[PDB]
Design a protein around this motif. Structure first.
Motif, mmCIF file in Angstrom:
data_model
loop_
_atom_site.group_PDB
_atom_site.id
_atom_site.type_symbol
_atom_site.label_atom_id
_atom_site.label_comp_id
_atom_site.label_asym_id
_atom_site.label_seq_id
_atom_site.Cartn_x
_atom_site.Cartn_y
_atom_site.Cartn_z
ATOM 1 N N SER A 349 0.835 -1.190 0.000
ATOM 2 C CA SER A 349 0.000 0.000 0.000
ATOM 3 C C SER A 349 0.873 1.245 0.000
ATOM 4 C CB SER A 349 -0.944 0.021 1.206
ATOM 5 O OG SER A 349 -1.835 -1.075 1.179
ATOM 6 N N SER A 350 0.242 2.370 -0.318
ATOM 7 C CA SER A 350 0.892 3.673 -0.312
ATOM 8 C C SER A 350 -0.191 4.729 -0.147
ATOM 9 C CB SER A 350 1.699 3.900 -1.592
ATOM 10 O OG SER A 350 0.848 3.964 -2.720
ATOM 11 N N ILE A 351 0.236 5.962 0.116
ATOM 12 C CA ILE A 351 -0.700 7.063 0.304
ATOM 13 C C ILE A 351 0.002 8.369 -0.031
ATOM 14 C CG2 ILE A 351 -0.349 7.859 2.678
ATOM 15 C CD1 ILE A 351 -3.264 7.857 3.116
ATOM 16 N N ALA A 352 -0.785 9.350 -0.461
ATOM 17 C CA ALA A 352 -0.253 10.657 -0.803
ATOM 18 C C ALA A 352 0.142 11.422 0.455
ATOM 19 C CB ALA A 352 -1.279 11.461 -1.600
ATOM 20 N N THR A 353 0.902 12.496 0.252
ATOM 21 C CA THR A 353 1.398 13.300 1.361
ATOM 22 C C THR A 353 0.421 14.386 1.793
ATOM 23 O OG1 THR A 353 3.792 12.975 1.168
ATOM 24 C CG2 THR A 353 3.041 15.165 1.832
ATOM 25 N N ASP A 354 -0.447 14.851 0.896
ATOM 26 C CA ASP A 354 -1.373 15.936 1.194
ATOM 27 C C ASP A 354 -2.808 15.446 1.357
ATOM 28 O OD1 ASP A 354 -2.025 15.284 -1.385
ATOM 29 O OD2 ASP A 354 -1.947 17.332 -2.165
ATOM 30 N N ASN A 355 -2.994 14.166 1.662
ATOM 31 C CA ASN A 355 -4.333 13.619 1.801
ATOM 32 C C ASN A 355 -4.990 14.108 3.085
ATOM 33 O OD1 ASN A 355 -4.746 11.285 4.000
ATOM 34 N ND2 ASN A 355 -2.600 11.318 3.347
ATOM 35 N N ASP A 356 -6.316 14.194 3.051
ATOM 36 C CA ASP A 356 -7.125 14.457 4.235
ATOM 37 C C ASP A 356 -7.702 13.124 4.694
ATOM 38 O OD1 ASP A 356 -8.706 15.364 6.263
ATOM 39 O OD2 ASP A 356 -9.738 16.901 5.084
ATOM 40 N N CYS A 357 -7.233 12.635 5.843
ATOM 41 C CA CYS A 357 -7.557 11.279 6.266
ATOM 42 C C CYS A 357 -9.044 11.081 6.526
ATOM 43 C CB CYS A 357 -6.757 10.915 7.519
ATOM 44 S SG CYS A 357 -6.558 9.137 7.796
ATOM 45 N N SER A 358 -9.829 12.156 6.591
ATOM 46 C CA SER A 358 -11.263 12.028 6.804
ATOM 47 C C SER A 358 -11.990 11.442 5.601
ATOM 48 C CB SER A 358 -11.859 13.391 7.149
ATOM 49 O OG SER A 358 -10.953 14.157 7.922
ATOM 50 N N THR A 359 -11.322 11.317 4.456
ATOM 51 C CA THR A 359 -11.886 10.670 3.280
ATOM 52 C C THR A 359 -11.315 9.276 3.057
ATOM 53 O OG1 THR A 359 -10.266 11.496 1.682
ATOM 54 C CG2 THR A 359 -12.078 12.966 2.293
ATOM 55 N N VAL A 360 -10.603 8.726 4.040
ATOM 56 C CA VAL A 360 -10.033 7.395 3.927
ATOM 57 C C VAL A 360 -10.675 6.403 4.891
ATOM 58 C CG1 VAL A 360 -7.859 6.133 3.746
ATOM 59 C CG2 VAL A 360 -7.906 8.587 3.350
ATOM 60 N N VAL A 361 -11.194 6.859 6.027
ATOM 61 C CA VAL A 361 -11.719 5.990 7.067
ATOM 62 C C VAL A 361 -12.920 6.667 7.716
ATOM 63 C CG1 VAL A 361 -9.591 4.741 7.545
ATOM 64 C CG2 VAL A 361 -10.034 6.913 8.710
ATOM 65 N N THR A 362 -13.509 5.973 8.687
ATOM 66 C CA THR A 362 -14.615 6.499 9.476
ATOM 67 C C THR A 362 -14.677 5.706 10.770
ATOM 68 O OG1 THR A 362 -16.008 7.401 7.705
ATOM 69 C CG2 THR A 362 -17.125 6.560 9.666
ATOM 70 N N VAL A 363 -14.575 6.399 11.899
ATOM 71 C CA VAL A 363 -14.670 5.790 13.220
ATOM 72 C C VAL A 363 -16.043 6.123 13.781
ATOM 73 C CG1 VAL A 363 -13.570 5.516 15.472
ATOM 74 C CG2 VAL A 363 -12.194 6.175 13.493
ATOM 75 N N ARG A 364 -16.727 5.119 14.315
ATOM 76 C CA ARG A 364 -18.039 5.334 14.910
ATOM 77 C C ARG A 364 -18.253 4.286 15.991
ATOM 78 N NH1 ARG A 364 -22.245 3.289 11.074
ATOM 79 N NH2 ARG A 364 -21.531 1.255 10.312
ATOM 80 N N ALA A 365 -19.423 4.340 16.615
ATOM 81 C CA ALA A 365 -19.794 3.391 17.652
ATOM 82 C C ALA A 365 -20.670 2.302 17.051
ATOM 83 C CB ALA A 365 -20.531 4.098 18.789
ATOM 84 N N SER A 366 -20.303 1.042 17.300
ATOM 85 C CA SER A 366 -21.119 -0.062 16.811
ATOM 86 C C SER A 366 -22.525 0.001 17.384
ATOM 87 C CB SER A 366 -20.460 -1.396 17.154
ATOM 88 O OG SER A 366 -19.079 -1.371 16.845
ATOM 89 N N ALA A 367 -22.669 0.525 18.598
ATOM 90 C CA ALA A 367 -23.981 0.798 19.174
ATOM 91 C C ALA A 367 -24.532 2.045 18.495
ATOM 92 C CB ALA A 367 -23.882 0.981 20.684
#
Length: 378
Positions: A349-367
């Motif tokens: 894998s690889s990733i850019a240097t100027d990425n905004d990580c909010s468009t790569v993942v999402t953390v939430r509560a399973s509840a």
């Protein structure tokens, strides 16, 4: 294809290379093919060229001057007269080559040589006067560049406003417009109307959901049909049967499919087609997939991938570029700190240097899906 002013015949058929050099001459010169270099049927003559010297886009054809002299000849004659060479050679008019549905709302059109659409990118209205789509269809009213060419200028990509359905066709319009489509230069020959084309279905995309599962996406509803071994749709294939329909590539080799149940696709009609790998193989970055040409070989491939819920629809043909599979699964999530996480990625894998990580993942509560945590930084 060279039209004629009278019914034409060749004394003995098939002609050879040596005869054909005395029948047609090209400017610039060309080398003709080794098999079926020329033939006639009514008021039309087809000449097959060599793959080492293809059509260029600023070429002209004429009746060879030697076609009407000597006795050791096999001339192309109308009735009893041999054809004569025109004073001025004729310019060759390019025509559209193929159409394809690489998506439910996108096409793709091939060309015989490099071309041009102007000095600026058209809009929907301008390209609505170039291409005539037989059905009650529309061009995209939201795409900024609904018609565009690729880097080599041999493929033209169209965007539609209604879903493509089996039975679609494309052909240029009768009246010219300002930009139009031309060959080899902005001031080159203009394209002409001719043989109405049929749009064939091919692969759209493919992602791997587990280490051994793949999911292809189809531009339209499709079933797998059997001709003589059965008489209708199938339900499950093996490595051998689902290996005369497509393949999974890796570098110079091939990946081994499942010994049983390798291909699955509904009988009532589905848009997803599942491929299972071998128990001792696994998906890795850089893997490809494509429909093989053998799918269209009805003499051999009894079970094959076809559109609509019937065999009266079109079959599936290879894409111009091998489809690379997208990773679609992650291994595990760790909390390596109070505010830092670490996720196992199944492949390189690889990733850019100027990425905004909010468009790569999402953390939430399973509840309940509320109460997301804020992801910050690259």
């Amino acid at each position: 294809k060279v039209t004629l002013s009278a019914t034409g015949t060749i004394t003995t058929t098939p002609a050879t290379v040596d005869d054909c050099n005395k029948i047609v001459t090209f400017t610039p010169a060309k080398t003709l093919a080794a098999t079926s270099p020329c033939s006639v049927a009514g008021t039309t003559l087809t000449v097959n060229l060599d793959k080492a010297t293809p059509y260029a886009g600023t070429d002209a054809v004429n009746i060879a001057a030697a076609n009407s002299l000597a006795a050791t000849t096999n001339p192309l004659k109308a009735g009893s007269l041999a054809f004569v060479a025109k004073a001025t050679a004729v310019t060759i008019d390019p025509n559209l080559y193929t159409a394809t549905a690489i998506d439910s709302l996108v096409y793709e059109v091939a060309l015989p040589a490099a071309s041009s659409v102007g000095s600026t990118a058209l809009t929907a209205a301008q390209c609505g006067a170039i291409l005539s789509l037989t059905g009650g269809r529309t061009i995209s009213s939201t795409v900024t560049a609904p018609c565009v060419l690729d880097t080599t200028k041999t493929l033209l990509t169209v965007s539609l406003g209604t879903a493509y359905a089996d039975g679609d066709t494309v052909t240029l319009q009768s009246t010219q417009a300002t930009p139009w489509l031309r060959a080899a230069s902005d001031t080159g020959p203009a394209y002409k109307v001719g043989s109405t084309l049929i749009v064939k279905p091919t692969i759209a995309s493919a992602k791997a959901t587990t280490a051994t599962t793949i999911e292809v996406t189809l531009p339209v509803t499709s079933v797998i049909w059997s001709t003589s071994g059965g008489a209708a749709v199938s339900t499950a294939l093996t490595a051998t049967e689902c290996g005369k329909i497509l393949s999974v590539k890796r570098g110079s080799g091939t990946v081994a499919l499942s010994a049983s149940g390798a291909c699955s696709l509904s009988s009532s009609g589905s848009t997803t087609l599942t491929v299972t790998l071998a128990s001792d193989q696994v998906f890795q970055a850089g893997d490809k997939i494509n429909i093989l040409a053998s799918n269209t070989d009805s003499a051999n491939t009894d079970k094959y991938l076809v559109a609509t819920t019937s065999s009266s629809g079109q079959a599936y043909i290879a894409r111009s570029s091998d489809v690379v599979i997208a990773p679609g699964f992650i291994n595990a999530a760790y909390a390596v700190g109070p505010n830092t996480l670490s996720v196992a990625l199944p492949v390189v894998s690889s990733i850019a240097t100027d990425n905004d990580c909010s468009t790569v993942v999402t953390v939430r509560a399973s509840a309940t899906p509320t109460t997301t945590r804020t992801v910050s930084g690259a």
